[PDB]
Design a protein around this ligand. Structure first.
Ligand code: CLA
Ligand code: CLA
Ligand code: CLA
Ligand code: CLA
Ligand code: CLA
Ligand code: CLA
Ligand code: CLA
Ligand SMILES: CC1=C(/C=C/C(C)=C/C=C/C(C)=C/C=C/C=C(C)/C=C/C=C(C)/C=C/C2=C(C)CCCC2(C)C)C(C)(C)CCC1
Ligand SMILES: CC1=C(/C=C/C(C)=C/C=C\C(C)=C\C=C\C=C(C)/C=C/C=C(C)/C=C/C2=C(C)CCCC2(C)C)C(C)(C)CCC1
Ligand SMILES: CCCCCCCCCCCCO[C@H]1O[C@H](CO)[C@@H](O[C@H]2O[C@H](CO)[C@@H](O)[C@H](O)[C@H]2O)[C@H](O)[C@H]1O
Ligand SMILES: CC1=C(C/C=C(\C)CCC[C@H](C)CCC[C@@H](C)CCCC(C)C)C(=O)c2ccccc2C1=O
Ligand code: SF4
Ligand code: SF4
Lengths: 161, 49, 81, 138, 730
């Protein structure tokens, strides 16, 4: 009922701010994002890696196969993996040497669940390095790979119009 | 002493992007204000033009 | 040095003279008289940033003061954050 | 944050005030006396009404509490406190310590002032080029 | 102060050493204060705590200006009468190339003054009276010499009303701080009773006296001087004595008429102004509104009303203040006055409102760039003065908790966005061009962005322009063509040397300039917006409003702590806008000549001053000095020994003054001190200096002498560059 929730700016204290509002926090947005890392960690990553790798994968095709350097290609290759498959490699390790910001190094192991987590204090890290690996390892097999059922597909395609 | 050092990796290549290509054996033959060469440009960006 | 910009003077009296500055300065130490006899260049300075609001008012009668620590904190920066 | 509201001091929301590295370093909350409820300027673009107390709002960085302070003594009162919080409680305890109101004596603390020599003629350069025999490290 | 207060000196103070801020100018001597005081001659922190007068001063200063325009332009209208050019031109227009102004021949001077004319030596003019002017029908040189003194009448009097305020014992609070009417009046009967009154002297007299001028004669072969009342036979032509209507209304019959009016649309042929006859109707149809409109009303009433959930409580009593801020009710205004001037700058060039413009090229682009720098020079201002609000004006806090207090609530936010906006632009809004170079210099056009190469394919045509002319599907009735001739549909046919006006069709290469404007308009505003918003307190300084909107910079600490403030956001925001406008100008003339400005020739084969070189060649940003700066400008650096020459001969100075600014812009301050003493020393040896302690420039004065010079430098450079490539071919 309350003019917008029991009317609060933030979670409650005003003072951090973020002026929590729609597009910050509406039952409708907020939800379109929790198997995914925004709030909770669904599973120990390893898997999120490829839905991340892959979805972002078959992107970067018409960007560099329809806007390519000398464009609209007559080659077997593009439509194409090509260079883009090269980008997921540069990308994916530009990605790794960031997982040298956190190492923090363990196996604990839980994608299995005890007791509704809370994480407890997930906010902030508590991702060890042996986590950020299995993500940016999922990234490679998500990038390269997610680059082929892009071109594998014939483009049945829609014409400008 | 890390100097002198870098002045010769400069000079070496100055004499070595010469003499498989970019004349002498035409520029000595006798050299009239046309365009004797240092080196070969190689960029993938280039057109045919 | 790690904050070393000399504002010292000679009166170090602080009435209709100078106070301005975010935390850094507790002074009023006295030294065994100078007329008003609150003296010194400083209190302990590992707390705040680098103004020269430090003179702007009440004499230093040689150098102004200024940026110079070099050796620089974040809290002493303003930004980390 | 509902399950405990301790609050004394009254904004509503802002974009302003502290973002994450107040948790990961050093915390910095200021507290105060009040009479009858008044409407105030802030740090961070503005403003609120006070009432009473603890009257203990928390700020980002120390420049900001003191900054009211000027703020807080025009329109007056004696009493303003500012403390520094960690994560993990204490050391560095900021306004509490002896007296307050710098411009008093009990004691010295601090400061010197001179280093080794006084203001007069350092036309004289810096001297020996850093060796660990001679008193150049304070 | 006390020379001697209150009651008991008439006797004026001239002398004993004089005034400001309380440790007033010392007694003991300095230089800076002579620079202070021209600056910040009015700020209004000082003179009085209490607004009291000042509103009682700003009415007087206003009077002075109104006079002054008047002193001006009597001058102008003089000049315009008795150094005539005008009588001669008007029989003669489209031959003439017109002056008001002549030198005298002393020393060099007179290269300058080169035959303009109906047979006299001149300096050619590009502001047009001679076109405001066409309107007067009656004519002759000695009058304008009456309109002239009629000018000096309004002045002396509209300048003794300024005696007749402040200095005279004079007025008090209520009179402004009860507003309640003020727009009521203003818009009703002046906004109205001018445009209204202007109607009455815009068909009465002007219409007829160019209705049969648009043929020739030697004037007065046409128009008697008073001629035009009880009389009128002459109205009969140009229409009826209403013959039998009554006070409009209807039980009226036309089998053939409808009252003068009869709307025009398009341009006159053989005077392509646009019809001198929609000009009455439109002004008439204005005034009414204003006539009805300025009849609101007395206030919070409307403002205190509607609220929303995002929307602002503040909206209400959105300002008891407003009545007495001032600095705010000027800042708002400048944005409008200012932003309502450069909307002139379009409707002008794509819809001339004076007889003989377009054909007259140079005498309406000068315009479109003068009017253009005001719809900009007045906008950055319109921010400065808000910053002047945002810091100071009210004694105390009691604005409270609104809409503003709202906007600020977010502020590292409204400006958090706007930022990325710009780097999105810039990358899509300039490196776009740089592609071309890097790849047309690499050279492979297949893949440029050329209007031909990257595919849209050869139409611009349909967006709005094509719906706009094409206009009468409509509830629209009217008039054979357009509101503006340029819009795509319609016409070959406009004018007699020359082309005046034609479609302008764009495509791409109108596409992306149009976008650089975006990014240029946007990062301009970022700096002013964030500037005026973070006016008073900031995450870097809280103790930030405390002297100043000005202060130099807080101090070496916090890392930088220099620019900050908001004099300086209104210092680096000018710096941009100088581009904002400086590149919009660069846009229009390269278009308007590459296409449009014309010639007609047998069978109308259009010959644009440049056969559309624009085509494939603005897109390259070198083409912008291949085709622009190095192409045109050849007329600036050829201009010696001529008549205009004063442009080529300026174009070096002021193309010097600019390259002097950097010295003021790029330098320290205790530097010119450290220097100013070596000087001061040499001075004392001979015994020649100390008194009035010579001092270097006041940190921010130095910035004041940047900027200001960087502009009157970098600007008149083109004022020269221009008048030098429309005078002479084009
Ligand atoms: C309708 C509004 C108009 C009015 C009435 C005012 C009024 C005011 N403005 Mg202001 N301002 C305006 C438009 C206006 N402004 C615009 C459009 C801008 C943007 C540029 C500004 C930017 C501005 C700033 C930054 C400041 C003010 C300030 C002020 C206040 C100080 C006035 C003063 O001392 O004169 C100042 C005039 C001079 C000292 C004369 C010097 C002029 C030089 C630069 C010459 C200009 C170049 C020209 C080509 C030279 C002549 C030709 C030569 C080569 C022969 C005053 C209340 C000042 C303040 O502190 O507020 C209290 C502050 O300085 N204004
Ligand atoms: C004939 C008379 C005259 C005299 C003797 C005075 C005398 C005085 N006036 Mg004053 N005043 C006058 C006519 C006069 N006024 C007129 C006609 C107006 C309205 C137009 C005003 C509006 C006015 C105001 C608002 C104020 C005064 C104030 C004052 C006092 C300060 C004067 C001063 O030093 O300013 C020196 C300035 C001048 C002598 C020149 C005035 C500027 C205008 C009118 C013309 C100059 C513009 C000109 C084109 C320059 C720019 C171009 C340049 C490149 C050449 C002083 C007692 C002030 C006061 O009460 O003390 C705080 C107050 O601020 N007057
Ligand atoms: C003092 C300095 C020295 C000198 C003599 C110059 C001189 C010049 N620099 Mg320069 N410069 C210097 C140091 C110097 N610079 C330094 C250290 C730098 C930084 C590295 C620069 C960076 C620089 C740049 C980027 C530019 C220049 C340019 C220029 C030239 C402008 C063209 C010109 O003046 O035509 C000479 C002819 C005249 C001046 C005719 C004058 C006739 C008119 C003005 C009327 C008579 C005068 C009258 C009083 C004016 C009316 C005012 C009235 C209202 C009182 C000029 C030759 C500009 C240029 O043109 O190309 C590079 C360019 O913008 N300089
Ligand atoms: C003509 C071009 C070329 C080709 C063959 C494709 C083909 C494809 N793009 Mg694509 N794209 C291109 C250029 C191209 N793109 C360019 C230049 C960009 C600029 C960013 C994109 C940006 C883009 C995005 C963001 C997405 C795609 C998606 C897709 C795929 C899904 C088809 C669809 O609409 O979902 C069919 C949906 C249902 C049946 C339900 C498809 C394989 C994705 C997609 O289209 O999913 C909706 C994803 O949306 N593209
Ligand atoms: C708008 C501006 C203003 C400006 C910039 C000028 C500028 C000029 N006027 Mg002028 N004038 C003006 C207002 C102005 N006038 C007014 C209001 C009047 C009516 C009193 C006059 C009446 C006037 C006369 C009678 C003359 C000038 C002349 C001139 C030129 C001679 C230069 C000079 O005055 O000193 C030197 C110069 C171009 C002189 C001229 O045109 O001969 C070349 C001529 O002497 N003016
Ligand atoms: C506010 C405006 C302006 C002014 C001062 C005048 C003034 C005048 N008009 Mg007039 N007029 C105007 C706008 C104006 N007109 C416009 C816009 C139109 C066309 C839309 C006309 C169409 C018009 C006609 C047809 C006539 C006048 C006449 C007159 C004169 C006497 C009758 C009258 O209108 O008022 C005074 C009121 C009464 C006498 C009653 C008077 C000199 C008449 C005339 O010549 O003199 C009698 C008559 O010929 N006007
Ligand atoms: C934050 C507040 C509150 C809320 C929750 C809303 C919500 C809405 N307003 Mg709204 N409004 C409010 C206060 C509010 N308003 C206030 C105070 C005013 C006066 C200032 C308005 C003036 C206003 C207007 C003029 C409009 C809205 C519209 C809308 C709707 C957007 C259209 C849409 O999503 O469907 C579209 C979904 C499809 C699937 C198609 C949305 C339901 C728009 C509307 O009527 O709906 C389109 C319309 O533009 N509002
Ligand atoms: C009581 C009476 C009356 C009254 C009368 C009068 C007094 C009137 C008037 C009239 C009027 C009162 C008019 C006015 C007009 C105005 C106008 C018309 C405006 C203007 C202006 C201008 C022209 C400007 C311009 C510009 C611009 C644009 C901006 C800036 C620049 C310049 C300035 C250029 C009557 C009649 C009923 C009668 C009975 C009695
Ligand atoms: C030896 C000597 C000298 C020197 C001289 C010289 C060397 C000079 C120069 C100069 C230069 C080398 C430059 C300058 C320039 C200036 C200027 C330039 C001024 C002004 C201006 C104006 C008037 C403007 C106007 C405008 C406007 C309106 C706005 C914008 C545009 C324009 C700019 C157009 C003398 C004799 C002095 C002194 C003695 C010694
Ligand atoms: C500049 C690149 C060309 C691309 C646009 C071309 C499409 C339209 C055709 C030409 C446009 C110019 O329009 C022009 O047409 C004719 C030139 O042949 C001229 O035709 C004019 O001259 C003659 C005199 O009676 C007659 O043929 C016409 O009745 C008359 O309109 C006109 O001066 C002008 O109306
Ligand atoms: C060059 C420069 C100076 C030096 C500039 C000076 C000292 C200009 C002032 C010179 C004045 C205008 C000379 C005035 C003397 C004459 C008016 C006196 C005789 C009167 C006549 C009849 C000639 C600064 O002070 C400065 C300050 C801050 C940032 C940058 C700079 C900067 O770049
Ligand atoms: S500022 Fe200088 S004079 Fe003033 S109290 Fe401090 S040391 Fe003394
Ligand atoms: S600005 Fe300077 S004097 Fe002031 S507190 Fe900081 S360091 Fe100390």
């Amino acid at each position: 009922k309350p003019t917008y929730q029991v009317i609060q700016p933030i979670n409650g204290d005003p003072f951090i701010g973020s002026l929590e509002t729609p597009v910050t926090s509406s039952p409708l947005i907020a939800w379109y994002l929790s198997n995914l890392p925004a709030y909770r960690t669904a599973v120990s990553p390893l898997l999120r890696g490829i839905e991340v790798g892959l979805a972002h994968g078959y992107l970067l095709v018409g960007p560099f196969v329809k806007a390519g350097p000398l464009r609209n290609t007559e080659i077997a290759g593009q439509a194409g993996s090509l260079a883009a498959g090269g980008l997921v490699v540069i990308l994916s390790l530009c990605l790794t040497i960031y997982g040298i910001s956190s190492f923090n190094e363990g196996a604990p192991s839980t994608a299995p669940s005890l007791t509704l987590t809370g994480r407890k204090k997930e906010p902030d890290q508590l991702q060890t390095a042996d986590g950020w690996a299995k993500f940016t390892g999922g990234f490679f097999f998500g990038g390269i790979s997610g680059v082929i059922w892009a071109y594998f597909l014939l483009y049945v395609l829609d014409l400008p119009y | 002493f890390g100097q002198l050092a870098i002045i010769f990796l400069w000079t070496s290549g100055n004499l070595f992007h010469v003499a498989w290509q970019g004349n002498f054996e035409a520029w000595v033959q006798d050299p009239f204000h046309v365009r004797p060469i240092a080196h070969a440009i190689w960029d993938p960006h280039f057109g045919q033009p | 040095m790690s904050h070393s910009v000399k504002i010292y003077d000679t009166c170090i009296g602080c009435t209709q003279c100078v106070r301005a500055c975010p935390t850094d300065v507790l002074e009023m130490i006295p030294w065994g008289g100078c007329k008003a006899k609150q003296i010194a260049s400083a209190p302990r300075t590992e707390d705040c940033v680098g103004c020269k609001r430090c003179e702007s008012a009440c004499p230093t009668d040689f150098l102004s003061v200024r940026v110079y620590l070099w050796h620089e904190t974040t809290r002493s920066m303003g930004l980390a954050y | 944050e509902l399950d405990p509201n301790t609050p004394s001091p009254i904004f509503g929301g802002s974009t302003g005030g502290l973002l994450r590295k107040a948790q990961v370093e050093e915390f910095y909350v200021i507290t105060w006396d009040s009479p009858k409820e008044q409407i105030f300027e802030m740090p961070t673009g503005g403003a609120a009404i006070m009432r009473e107390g603890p009257n203990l709002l928390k700020l980002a960085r120390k420049e900001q509490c003191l900054a009211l302070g000027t703020r807080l003594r025009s329109k007056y009162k004696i009493k303003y406190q500012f403390y520094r919080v960690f994560p993990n409680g204490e050391v560095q305890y900021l306004h509490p310590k002896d007296g307050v109101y710098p411009e008093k004596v009990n004691a010295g603390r601090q400061g010197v002032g001179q280093n080794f020599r006084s203001i007069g003629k350092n036309v004289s350069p810096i001297e020996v080029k850093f060796t660990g025999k001679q008193p150049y490290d304070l | 102060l006390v020379d001697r207060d209150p009651i008991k000196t008439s006797f004026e103070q001239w002398a004993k050493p004089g005034h400001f801020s309380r440790t007033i100018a010392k007694g003991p001597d300095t230089t800076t204060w002579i620079w202070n005081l021209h600056a910040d001659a009015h700020d209004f922190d000082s003179h009085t705590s209490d607004l009291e007068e000042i509103s009682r001063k700003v009415f007087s200063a206003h009077f002075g200006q109104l006079s002054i325009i008047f002193l001006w332009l009597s001058g102008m209208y003089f000049h315009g009468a008795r150094f005539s050019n005008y009588e001669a031109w008007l029989n003669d227009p489209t031959h003439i190339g017109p002056s008001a102004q002549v030198v005298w021949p002393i020393v060099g001077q007179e290269i300058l003054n080169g035959d303009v004319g109906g047979g006299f030596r001149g300096i050619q003019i590009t502001s047009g009276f001679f076109q405001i002017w066409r309107a007067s029908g009656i004519t002759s040189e000695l009058q304008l010499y009456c309109t002239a003194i009629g000018a000096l009448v309004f002045a002396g009097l509209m300048l003794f009303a300024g005696w007749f305020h402040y200095h005279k014992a004079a007025p008090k609070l209520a009179w402004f701080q009860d507003v309640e009417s003020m727009l009521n009046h203003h818009l009703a009967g002046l906004l109205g009773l001018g445009s209204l009154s202007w109607a009455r002297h815009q068909v009465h007299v002007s219409l007829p006296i160019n209705q049969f001028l648009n043929a020739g004669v030697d004037p007065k072969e046409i128009p008697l001087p008073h001629e035009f009342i009880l009389n009128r036979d002459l109205l009969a032509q140009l229409y009826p004595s209403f013959a039998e209507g009554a006070t409009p209304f209807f039980t009226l019959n036309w089998s053939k008429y409808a009252d003068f009016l009869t709307f025009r649309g398009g341009l006159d042929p053989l005077t392509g102004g646009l019809w001198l006859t929609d000009i009455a109707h439109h002004h008439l149809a204005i005034a009414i509104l204003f006539l009805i409109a300025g009849h609101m009303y007395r206030i919070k009433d409307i403002l205190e009303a509607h609220k929303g959930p995002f929307t602002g409580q503040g909206h209400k009593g959105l300002y008891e203040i407003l009545t007495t801020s001032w600095h705010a009710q000027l800042s708002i205004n400048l944005a409008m006055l200012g932003s309502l001037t450069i909307v002139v700058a379009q409707h002008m060039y794509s819809m001339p409102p004076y007889p003989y413009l377009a054909t007259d090229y140079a005498t309406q682009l000068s315009l479109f760039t003068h009017h253009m720098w005001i719809g900009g020079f007045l906008i950055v201002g319109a921010a400065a003065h808000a910053a002047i609000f945002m810091v100071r004006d009210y004694d105390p806090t009691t604005r409270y908790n609104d809409l503003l207090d709202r906007v600020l609530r977010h502020r590292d936010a409204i400006i958090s966005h706007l930022n990325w906006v710009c780097i999105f632009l810039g990358f899509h809004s300039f490196g776009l061009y740089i592609h071309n170079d890097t790849m047309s210099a690499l050279g492979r056009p297949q893949d440029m962005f050329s209007d031909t190469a990257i595919q849209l394919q050869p139409v611009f045509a349909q967006w709005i322009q094509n719906t706009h002319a094409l206009a009468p599907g409509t509830t629209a009735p009217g008039a054979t063509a357009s509101t503006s001739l340029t819009w795509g549909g319609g016409d070959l046919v406009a004018v007699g040397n020359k082309v005046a006006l034609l479609p302008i069709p764009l495509g791409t290469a109108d596409f992306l300039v149009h976008h650089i404007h975006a990014f240029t308009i946007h990062v301009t505003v970022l700096i002013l917006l964030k500037g005026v918003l973070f006016a008073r307190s900031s995450r870097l300084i809280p103790d930030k409003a405390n002297l100043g909107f000005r202060f130099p910079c807080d101090g070496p600490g916090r890392g930088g702590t220099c620019q900050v403030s908001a004099w300086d956001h209104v210092f680096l925001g000018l710096f941009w806008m100088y581009n904002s406008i400086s590149v919009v100008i660069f846009h229009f003339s390269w278009k308007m000549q590459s296409d449009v400005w014309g010639t007609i020739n047998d069978q109308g084969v259009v010959t644009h001053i440049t056969a559309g070189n624009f085509a494939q060649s603005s897109i390259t940003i070198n083409g912008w000095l291949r085709d622009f700066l190095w192409a045109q400008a050849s007329q600036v650096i050829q201009s010696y020994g001529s008549s205009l020459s004063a442009y080529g001969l300026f174009f070096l100075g002021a193309h010097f003054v600019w390259a002097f600014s950097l010295m003021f812009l790029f330098s320290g301050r205790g530097y010119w001190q450290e220097l100013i003493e070596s000087i001061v020393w040499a001075h004392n040896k001979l015994k020649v200096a100390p008194a009035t302690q010579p001092r270097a420039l006041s940190i921010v004065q130095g910035r004041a002498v940047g900027v200001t010079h960087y502009l009157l430098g970098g600007i008149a450079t083109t004022w020269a560059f221009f008048l030098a490539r429309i005078i002479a071919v084009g």
